[PDB]
Amino acid sequence: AALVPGVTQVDNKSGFLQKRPHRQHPGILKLPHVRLPQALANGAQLLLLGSAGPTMENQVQTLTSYLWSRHLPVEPEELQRRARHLEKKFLRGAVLHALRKTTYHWQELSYTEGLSLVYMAARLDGGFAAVSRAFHEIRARNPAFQPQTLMDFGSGTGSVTWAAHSIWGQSLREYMCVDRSAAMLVLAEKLLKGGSESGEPYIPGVFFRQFLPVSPKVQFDVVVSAFSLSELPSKADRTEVVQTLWRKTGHFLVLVENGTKAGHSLLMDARDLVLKGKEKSPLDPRPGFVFAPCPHELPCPQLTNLACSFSQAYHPIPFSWNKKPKEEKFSMVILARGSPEEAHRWPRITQPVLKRPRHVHCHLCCPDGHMQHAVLTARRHGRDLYRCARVSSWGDLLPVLT
């Protein structure tokens, strides 16, 4: 509960309210509709001139829905509890058949040359928008940050590399991109060279590797994993990767997944793993804290039954099936080295803001670790804070103190 009617007041630092309107309040983090770079948009279409007919529309849709509805692989432990429960009810072959149903069949996707094109036509634009929104968080609240180095685990189509260039292009000097699939690496380099096998890379310093380097000595300023931890075959694999990524993180670790229950639970495992440091004597002894979106390091209050996701509207790459703008629903967590900058953390709006006559509905994750459904009105809370919430939107911060 970070909203007490009549007690909580807006936080006026930098002499905000006097010096600026309410529509530009510092908790505003909304990003206008994302347009991809023309070089990327042109390159993607050129690579698809061979086959972009009616079959491709069906293929792109099938892949998009399949990836969206994927569940995390069922760990064995979950499997025996389901097995015994069905066993007691029946009282082995019958149980297994009843276990093939009511359980999710998780399969590896071998990203070959064919399925790599379908992925690029389905997730390049969507993935780019989600990562751009995540990076906007780091820029907006810390505009002095000028990273010189970046690593991207699970670099399928290079969306992270392009998004990082659009924000920190004047200071980044190295883009390490890791991806086990040869075809995806082949596709990602074509996209940097204007969609042709021969050309000059549009971004300088991109390094492509097939295996994740494992060494605490080499440490990157921004480590990014976007829509990649969901492709790992088990929780042990996710545990090992996230530990390595954190060990090689210099300032910020940006993890982004789908805005589903499977995605959100995945990131809360990684969030707890980094926060609950287990290494006895790490090379980098600095602690970790959640830079965004959580205003606390306490357990997620929405992880029980609900999820936590955010939305970013973007303009899809022109195709035979992309006409109207789309929305990218994603889950994110950003983990930063060091300690929180100050004690004046602000609630996060984690759900669409509903504007109604003279009152506004905001669902806030508060610094104390609890969600608060606040209906803000001018009479109860005040003219200033009501106007701040009137202009706020999904994924913004609410500047409230005491």
């Binding site: 180095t149 000097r173 190295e174 390490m176 310093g205 390094f207 590797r209 080499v218």
Partner: protein
């Protein structure tokens, strides 16, 4: 120091625009532990001036840079490795000077300062040469430098400069 990663053989092949692993016509030492061993056998390079020949990918260059040298002069014949060496130089400000040219014709007597010139009868003059060159180029080079030692000129204007 934060130096860029050593290029891999695939990156080397693409950089040389060969598109294959058979038309390379060259061998590289892409193991930093062996290059560390070589630079260790080269002696104590603390605040020393090193003349490197035939770097290529730059494993020897990185190993020398990790040693606390004062200034590393690097002469490379192939232009295609110069961007990588320039990234290396950007990583280490002021410790790397890249020159394009042939080691068989490059003039080293002018490269370094005249204050490093010590008498012949004294100890070696804090200037070292290190090299992993093609075997078709090291024999002419050593013959040329043996002549220079006989004349106490060229790289040996500074004194009894040591070579590895």
């Amino acid at each position: 120091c934060r130096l860029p990663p050593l290029p891999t053989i695939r990156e080397i092949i693409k950089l040389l625009r060969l598109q294959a692993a058979k038309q390379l016509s060259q061998n590289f030492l892409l193991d930093l532990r062996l290059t560390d061993k070589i630079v260790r056998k080269a002696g104590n390079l603390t605040n020393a001036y090193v003349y490197e020949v035939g770097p290529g990918p730059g494993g020897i260059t990185r190993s020398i840079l990790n040693a606390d040298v004062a200034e590393l002069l690097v002469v490379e014949k192939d232009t295609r490795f110069i961007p990588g060496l320039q990234m290396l130089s950007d990583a280490a400000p002021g410790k790397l000077r890249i020159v394009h040219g042939d080691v068989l014709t490059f003039k080293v007597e002018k490269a370094f300062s005249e204050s490093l010139k010590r008498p012949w009868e004294d100890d070696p003059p804090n200037v070292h040469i290190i090299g992993n060159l093609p075997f078709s180029v090291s024999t002419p080079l050593i013959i040329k430098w043996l002549e220079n030692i006989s004349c106490r000129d060229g790289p040996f204007v500074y004194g009894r400069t040591q070579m590895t």
